[PDB]
Amino acid sequence: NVLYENQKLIANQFNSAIGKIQDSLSSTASALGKLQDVVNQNAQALNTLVKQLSSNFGAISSVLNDILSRLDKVEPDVDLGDISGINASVVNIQKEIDRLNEVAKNLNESLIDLQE
Amino acid sequence: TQNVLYENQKLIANQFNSAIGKIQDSLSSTASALGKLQDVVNQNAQALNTLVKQLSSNFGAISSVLNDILSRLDKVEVDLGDISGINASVVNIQKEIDRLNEVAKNLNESLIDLQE
Amino acid sequence: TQNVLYENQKLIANQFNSAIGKIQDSLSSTASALGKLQDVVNQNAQALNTLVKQLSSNFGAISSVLNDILSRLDKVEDVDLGDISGINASVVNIQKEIDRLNEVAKNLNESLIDLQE
Ligand SMILES: [Zn+2]
Ligand SMILES: [Zn+2]
Ligand SMILES: [Zn+2]
Ligand SMILES: [Zn+2]
């Protein structure tokens, strides 16, 4: 009687819910991907900056020690801080992003096609 | 003797409405975490970009002073690396954070009021 | 007819328990990914702050050496530079949201539907 109408309702609601969860999972995956990419770029930008900063300080302290050695001849050593141990680590969540997209596609096999 | 089926329907509906509730909470927490990650990633991107610009300014000022000192020293008796190309990109996932918060609210329309 | 109804109820319960299972796995993977992001964002933020401090130290030492060279050259015959110590990288705290996700992942077990025969 009404039991059948209730079963149709549950199934429809449940299939609606899953559809929305699928969309939510795929958006989560997207958001975690864009974070992964930008976090890693920013890590690499920092690590490139560090290497080029070490290079610049190496060149500066060389020139300064020359100038001080020339002032010695005309009239103790300049040692700048080492900033090459500083490193930005990268993040690897590609496994979790894949898993989210997998479950998003897998949830199609969780839908209800009731017996007419 | 259709009592078992109606009590099963009531169980399914309660369990479902419970589950969706928990998911709605999980979706909101996700959206929150992505929002805080977006804010901090973007602040840290800017901090790096502000550093890089004021570092190019400083090295400019140094190389100027060094060239003046080397000319002075010749009369009594350098070019260093550019890092302005180093730039931290920013992230835009406010679209995906929206879509999570939308689906969290929209799941209220997936809930079940059983008929009787 | 009441056979079809019962078999439909079984189907609904098995699909539902299926779906929830997959979602639990998805919530755990989300929590993982936010955890690894939080750790790496925070390590990067500290690396930048440690770089800023050591850089301000190096520029202090350079401008000191340059001012001495300029005073020597004036005796044979302060001009300083930009402050960066102000620059600071914030840290992120989402351990509350990660905890909640794993909480909800476990709590969904109480939403499942049991062997009724
Ligand atoms: Zn969809
Ligand atoms: Zn000497
Ligand atoms: Zn934001
Ligand atoms: Zn030159």
Q: Does B64 touch chain C (CB under 8 A)?
A: no
| Cβ contact A30:B51 at 8 Å | no
Question: Angle at Cα C78 formed by Cα B82 and Cα B71, nearest 5°?
Answer: 60
Region at A111 (left for phi over 0; alpha for psi -120 to 50; beta for the rest): beta
Question: What gap in Å lies between CA B61 and CA C105, rounded to an integer?
Answer: 57
How far is ligand 1, taken at its centre, from the CA of residue B60, in Å? 54
Domain boundaries, position C17: 1-117
Question: What gap in Å lies between CA C32 and CA C25, rounded to an integer?
Answer: 11
Experimental method: X-ray
Q: What is the DSSP letter of A80?
A: P
3-state SS assignment for residue C104: helix
| Cβ contact C45:B45 at 8 Å | no
Which residues have C-beta within 8 Å of that of residue B64, sequence separation ≥ 6? none
Question: Angle at Cα C6 formed by Cα C5 and Cα C7, nearest 5°?
Answer: 95
**C48: distance to nearest CA of chain A, Å?**
8
CATH number of the structural domain spanning residue A88: 1.20.5.300
Number of CB pairs, chain A paired with chain C, less than 8 A apart: 131
Query: In whole angstroms, how far apart are CA A24 and each of A103, A108, B32, B64, B65?
Result: 11, 14, 14, 56, 58
What are the helix (H) ranges across chain A?
2-74, 94-106
Question: What gap in Å lies between CA B64 and CA A68, rounded to an integer?
Answer: 17
> In chain A, how many domains are there?
1
Identify from C15, C51, C83, C87 which residue to disrupt to test chain B contact, counting B C-beta atoms within 10 A and taking the largest count: C87
